[PDB]
Symmetry: C3
């Protein structure tokens, strides 16, 4: 009919244009607010993915654990054996469980860096299931290696750790693919990726820096 | 004077800001609609480029053809002899003309991948003009080669196809530059690029997948 | 109360959405204008950075100079000895001071391309301070080298220029870091970067092209 007269309405239209164009900053405020909306959405979306797969993260038997089982705070460490930052990052992660009895870590091998991360992983898993107590040695050694993994040096590490006896089961591939499906469900794109409390860290971190985070979650009880 | 009072107008201005900022989604709807506008424009712009150069695509003599001439549906294949996907992609393209008599293909060599795509092409063109019937052999062989092209292996393929006799004419460079100007006119950035009906495909495709498209254009009569 | 009735206001809100969405171009005009705002801001921000550090650009003693000192127009040349475009670019820069007595150039070595740009630079600086007249030879030679710099070939150039006698002072590292802090203050990201009048050029340029710019600043008196 209508609620504004023709003239008024037309002027409104003109006012839109003029407002945004003569004052750009309003567009920036709108951008920022759309950004802030999308961020917040994702963050909540992660927080749900994370909260849903509690039982594959924390309660998988096939997944290797470092430190006590009862340990109040259990971290989760997505590592690739071929990833150079993981090799640098892992020792710390280990150090905390020795320093902090209440802390433990869980290992999730990922095959993205190469064929050998896959075979390596598979080995470590086979070991884990066939003999848990043994695992740490082989894990450690494989991480200690700087050079890229081949099928022999896997034998060589396995041998140098007295685990060469163990056959790579096929059951251990499921675990790999599961760590793989899992890393997708959490929208994890890279490695090392560490789960702590309700927070995830996709890179490597200084020790002192790490200690404050783990203490901060210790305080969360 | 004017069509809204000062107050009203000011409130309108304020309402712009508040609307977009308190409701980000409107900005997203506007984005999407500007995107949709630009897309549609380009698509129409391609469809014109494509429709204008009908006569260089379909009616060039210097361009090599595979299959019957009268063939109802003529595809056009922009290929680089050094491009690995083209080597994989070409055999199919050929298979259809043997399966489907109504189909033919036209070859457009492009020199972007290396000096040798240029010289190779030039050869194939020289051959095409000096002796059309011969072409297919040399084309085939050059595609069959996995290793990167040098000036000798060009001789070697030419020899293995009994075309070594033919001199690279300078007239054949025009054809190259023309295929080159043409690929620009159609905003073709990469290779393999295949023209079919009024549609263009810039990569490689499964056979079964391809058959449905060619049949779909066969139905377009 | 208020300045528009409920209905009117609601319609305004609806009008925002409809205006931007049914007419995308307004959003484009707003983009462009926000872009134009940010550009203009930066340009003014550079022009201030440039104008503030007049005294480190033009009046540093530790910085090497090519051409007369009194020279009316002094260019400034950020070059890396390992940068291939700088090697190509420098001779011209030199040619102008020989062609145009009124022109001079100042050299600012930058260490971003490699360790050897740093050591090279440091040498050239040490030389500059210990003996200014000598500098040009070593600068020239180091630029004349196509192959990447090592610690020996630095000796070799120094030797071939009869400057091997000079010790790399530690005082010359300050100059490097200063050229480094300076290049940051001007938001210089790459090399060769040349300051001329109130304008900066981050790449290499044809001679004839360069002559017009230097003449254009000569006219700016």
């Amino acid at each position: 009919n209508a609620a504004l007269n023709a003239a008024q309405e037309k002027e409104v239209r003109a006012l839109v244009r003029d407002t945004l164009v003569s004052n750009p900053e309003i567009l920036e405020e709108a951008i920022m607010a759309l950004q802030t909306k999308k961020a917040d959405e994702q963050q909540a979306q992660f927080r749900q993915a994370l909260a849903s797969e509690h039982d594959a993260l924390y309660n998988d038997a096939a997944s290797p654990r470092i430190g006590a089982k009862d340990a109040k705070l259990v971290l989760v460490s997505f590592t690739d054996y071929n990833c150079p930052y993981c090799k640098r990052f892992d020792p710390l992660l280990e150090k905390i469980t020795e320093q902090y009895p209440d802390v433990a870590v869980i290992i999730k091998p990922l095959p993205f860096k190469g064929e050998s991360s896959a075979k390596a992983s598979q080995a470590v898993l086979s070991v884990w299931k066939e003999d848990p107590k043994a695992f740490l040695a082989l894990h450690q050694r494989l991480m200690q290696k700087k050079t890229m993994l081949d099928n022999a040096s896997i034998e060589d590490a396995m041998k140098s750790t007295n685990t060469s006896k163990i056959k790579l089961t096929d059951d251990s591939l499921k675990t790999l693919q599961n760590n793989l499906e899992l890393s997708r469900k959490l929208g994890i794109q890279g490695t090392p990726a560490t789960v702590i409390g309700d927070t995830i860290l996709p890179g490597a971190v200084d020790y002192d820096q790490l200690e404050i985070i783990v203490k901060e979650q210790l305080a969360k009880v």
